[model samples]
Target: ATFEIVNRCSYTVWAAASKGDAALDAGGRQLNSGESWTINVEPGTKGGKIWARTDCYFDDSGSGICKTGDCGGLLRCKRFGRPPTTLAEFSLNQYGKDYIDISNIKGFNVPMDFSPTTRGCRGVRCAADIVGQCPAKLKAPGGGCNDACTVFQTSEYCCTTGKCGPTEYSRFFKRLCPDAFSYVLDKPTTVTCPGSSNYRVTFCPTA
Candidate 1:
């Protein structure tokens, strides 16, 4: 996918992405304005980064700080689009196979392994189904085995860091700045690793 920048200010906005010393603007240098750039999808990889800059002179007249490496007073690289997060890897064992009724947790990886987190030290994992909280009792609801293994079916495969129950990021933020973060779904929504076809058995961090 691509994004078009509509500069509200009269200033121009420049855009670009990178690998190493190979940039875009200077023939492998700084990017220029009034141009449409593309995202490079590396084979077998899920993500990449894109950058943008502007040339609005940030003068000291308004008591604003100015520096050589300044963003040229324009909206320079205001936001960086992170690459697709890597799907969590699962590795089920024989025992894992036996109790198809058990539950487990998983996590999302930023660029293979950037910001790894578990919802409250408890990463998401496949469960006996979505009837209740995880670690679903190997027993029944009213006191009998509810063979509704259907819940643990392919339907509830993917596990994401959402904003319902306590999460790692939320817990930390709540403690340091309780009012700073919200108990909403701030985490990125992701799909199951390799989709439903490549399902495997990977234990939760504590599992």
Candidate 2:
């Protein structure tokens, strides 16, 4: 039997191993959001369950193959009662991304922001988070505290949380590269071209 696993977690998972038939005590592997993996299984391998761990934070939604009938497309045995596979969880959005991939010719880009429902990128925050400062409003010399929400037309705010409006950086990123997968190259490998220019891909994490 062929089995597939999906990740619906918040971050990129590390490794997922299965127990039972494929149970070499091997756990699942790492997969970012909207990622999937397939494993082969024999008919009667005493299939048990699956779980995953990662360097990322832990999320205990308290629901998965066990309680909610929504397996997220995880292929478990028909006999799978409650307390289903712990590690192997199928993410719903991952499957949606695949559907969108084939439905359209152009692939999806990393940090995909097709819709608020199907958000891409591990997590997106305001640009202020990166710069550690925000742009205050340009006011006349005699003007009072003019810096405020650009679109909302309001300036009054508390010291604990200032008022800043939306930044469309996430949407813009998706527009530029809509079909980028997180791990295009798992390892470093050089590309040799017959042309004069040598094509090389380097490692660089997103900032």
Candidate 3:
């Protein structure tokens, strides 16, 4: 029922979520290092995504742009942001389990952790040095690493064929972050928790 987002990076991070694209937890806000933001969610809220926008700049009109994962050049995202950013996706209280996942299906930007605060629940994280270790062709324009599916648009990479497996690229990520989803069909990406479990998502979680 609760989602807490924390910033552990040394720099500033602007957070976003598509809970209504609902402006949950102010929808988008600047979270400096050591700060956190939170929102309580209604049960059965599904298909939600949480991401971070980095290197942002805003004008007098409040029109803002971010170097990576920017959502339409707006600070307070009313919709999903750009890809190649890390994500912690969850569906709360669906049946008796809470579905939690860490994904690089869009690729990786920052190191992130998604964990349940409740006892007996496991966590998932992607803290790989993805940007610096990114493969040459799959790198994003300004920052972040791009998925082969996005870069090549091939069915094999995107899993559009329904028979695809990991590629040389996805394996690159798989090797780095085994607990996270590297491609659309990657294994063991979802982490389940008991009902009523609250969660925390931390960026750059060295601590």
Candidate 4:
């Protein structure tokens, strides 16, 4: 199956992804408005995420930074993107199904939509306007919103105890993106589809 990064925003977005230590089917490539890029995923590909970097500045050597979701300041991310990025995460063929979600657990920079391109799967999304409405204390200085874990940095918010649950802070995110992971142990947020399904991931879709 394949994953398509669709940009529907007015500004350009640098779409990036990673599967392990190496970058995935696409690097930090620029996607202008209405354009899309597809990444062919290996069967049973697991534990990877797709995100967008905004306001990125890079030289020909791929040395630069992004206003949001910068990955070690490299145009081509060799690792996961930093926090305050709206993430589309996937684990293919996990227990014979495709596990997927639009995660706000790291916080949100852009609105996202995730659905099956083929059939036999359900759709999940977090397409709310979270930027201007981000909580004052949980707002990212550069851009996007911040999760409670980042603002509080305590065992309760971080869920380090492994026995934790949602807090008032997490409720804020859940209110906006009910289908997304609002806290570390947000189990009801994930959706599963047929492992054979190809997927469509859209960023900044029309309201």
Candidate 5:
């Protein structure tokens, strides 16, 4: 179906998505406050992600950079955004359900929310004020908060051995946003919604 990208924040939010060889919808364009774009996903589309870029500057050739979530300096993203950004991951029409989740395994730059608009599916969001209060050690260079895994790179935080569990760092994100996935082993992070349900992705939802 349909994915409606909404900009609820007062500032402009540059929305981007990975379309997998399909025609891109102003996916890299700037969406002003109160504006939205409805992107129709073709059948069999899989492994797609949607994210927002903040404090961006682009030229006439659509080449520029973003303060957060820059996709290799391309306006039209052919892949996922960089770390220190919120992600809305989805696998559409997979095994009779649409798998969706809000992942912070990378990090958190902006507040985001993902949910089914019509279908009776559970909604997930990470609306906490994470940037201003990010722990000193987990903070990323320049700006943006970093996940413990990204900062420490230890087996305990990265779960490289597959026997890992939550650390004090993952719990920090979990305590703020209980529904979103905080780490690799975080459970109950994904939701199974009907395949044809309408969805909404909001940037700075709290604003």
Candidate 6:
């Protein structure tokens, strides 16, 4: 699977990813507006993630901090970063299927479009301006909006148990981007793509 990461935001965006079933660089890359990066995923990759960081300050050695989606301030991410980040999750070519989804379970930062460039399968997009319209309770300090889980830290928003459901905050998220997953148990938003298809993850995407 080939995944292209694009930055269309007016500002800079630092791309971060998790351990790949398909093997991607953990230390992420810095992308200015209009810059892009690509990752080739070997079949059978599972639980891989990609997210963007903003308001970052890094040293020459690749260590830095981001107001959002910070992976312990490491240039290379060893784990998933902090909240208020839009997420792209993927498991490619599993049992002749490719699983892909855009997630707001952590929260929203930039407008995003995670879609197939080569197949008919539906892709998810959350291009709403949630950062400006978010409620004060869900607002973060630097940028973007926080999820209820980050603010209230309850099972209702966190969905720690399998039985969890949506709350008022989840509804707000869903209202903004129905295609992206707004809660942990949000099954309707999860989608499958054709096997071996290439995908694109665009930050600050347009229509």
The predicted structure with the larger lDDT, 4 or 5, is 4
Candidate closer to the true structure by TM-score (higher is better), 1 or 6? 6
Against the hidden true structure, what lDDT does model 1 obtain? 0.24
TM-score of 3: 0.93
Lowest lDDT 10-residue stretch of candidate 1: 107-116
- Candidate 3 positional error at 180, Å: 0.5
Which structure is stronger by TM-score: 2 or 3? 3
Q: Which candidate is the best by TM-score?
A: 4
After superposing candidate 1 on the true structure, give the runs of residues whose Cα lies further than 4 Å from its correct spot: 1-10, 19-34, 56-185, 189-207
Worst 10 residues of 5 by lDDT: 19-28
Worst 10 residues of 3 by lDDT: 18-27
How does candidate 4 fare on TM-score? 0.95
Where is model 5 more than 4 Å wrong at Cα? Answer: 19-26
Which tens-of-lDDT digit does each residue in 19-110 have in candidate 6?
53222654488889999898776677788888999999989887889999998887777778888899988888789988888888899988
TM-score of 5: 0.91
Q: Where does model 6 exceed 4 Å of error? A: 20-23
TM-score of every model versus the real structure: 0.23, 0.25, 0.93, 0.95, 0.91, 0.93
- In model 4, where do residues sit more than 4 Å from their true spots? none
Worst 10 residues of 4 by lDDT: 19-28
Instruction: Evaluate model 6: give its TM-score.
Output: 0.93
State the lDDT at 55 in candidate 2.
35
lDDT of 2 by residue, 1-207 (tens): 344545444555433334333332223334666566665433333323333332323235322331211123232323221211112211122222211110001111111111112223222111112112212332212211112221133332111245322233222222333332111221211111121111111011132
- What's model 1's lDDT at 115? 14
For candidate 3, write residues 55-152 as lDDT tens digits: 98978765888987788877777777787788888887788888899988888888999999888689988897989999999889888998898889
